[PDB]
Subunit: 114 residues, 3 copies
């Protein structure tokens, strides 16, 4: 899995430990080994949500499998909860796009996962 | 819907009001309410288009529906026009990727849009 | 085609000439003219891979065709090789997502590629 969060929250408001927390919680939610989880946080962005520059987050989760209606609801509750608790972003100002990647379309370690 | 523009144009060259203009124009183009439109502009990037570094833009539009051949031509005319007028980016140095998202694959407000 | 590399490697560690080298190597690999290749490098990012903040890269290649099992293996060896040689990133700390775009879903120059 690969997770990115783009946010207008400033860098100083991203707490120490946040990447590690994202890694751990995504491993557990997806079932994937922690070694395969990559996370990326991009603060200080020029963004708006509904026209407003109040705190918001625009995100993507790419995964080989483990994407589907029920799973994605669970991920959204998890990830919105973390963004609310840690970055003080309202859940209704978060979008997360879920992308089910075929293994042949993910490169890693000089090859692909097919 | 959510829209990102990655550009090498400097931040000071992004005019005041630009995020709002994008929000408004995308609401009208997609037909979705402005409350549901999110926009993200990433200036000052290290980029090349066709081997050169004049102003350029690499973009993505993620929408739940409202993506298709004729719609996308109209969005491209609209968005290239805005990037030309406001950021002085030639239309032949813009790529926009259109992504039709399923509602179950978009998280928001602790759940999905399904 | 367009390629993005997000990395925690600092900007000063990105060699002069890297954008041009990516352009040329991707033109050759995809078989597309260099004029149609766009590249975007994003250093200094807050990211982790497997929980670790050692050097890593998270990448995307969007192409209208020229995406498939064997092609993507070849791209991954090429790109991991460049990231190792030029940015000193371990291949096993690189993900590259390959996205085969429909021509009608790519805007350019006021229209689409359809």
């Amino acid at each position: 899995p690969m997770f990115i969060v783009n946010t207008n929250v400033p860098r100083a408001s991203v707490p120490d430990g946040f990447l590690s927390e994202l890694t751990q919680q995504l491993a557990q939610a997806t079932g994937k080994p922690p070694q395969y989880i990559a996370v990326h946080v991009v603060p200080d962005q020029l963004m708006a949500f509904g026209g407003s520059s109040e705190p918001c987050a625009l995100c993507h989760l790419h995964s080989i499998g483990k994407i589907g209606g029920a799973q994605n609801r669970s991920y959204s509750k998890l990830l919105c909860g973390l963004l609310a608790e840690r970055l003080r972003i309202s859940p209704d100002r978060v979008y997360i796009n879920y992308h089910d990647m075929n293994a042949a379309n993910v490169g890693w370690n000089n090859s692909t996962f097919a």
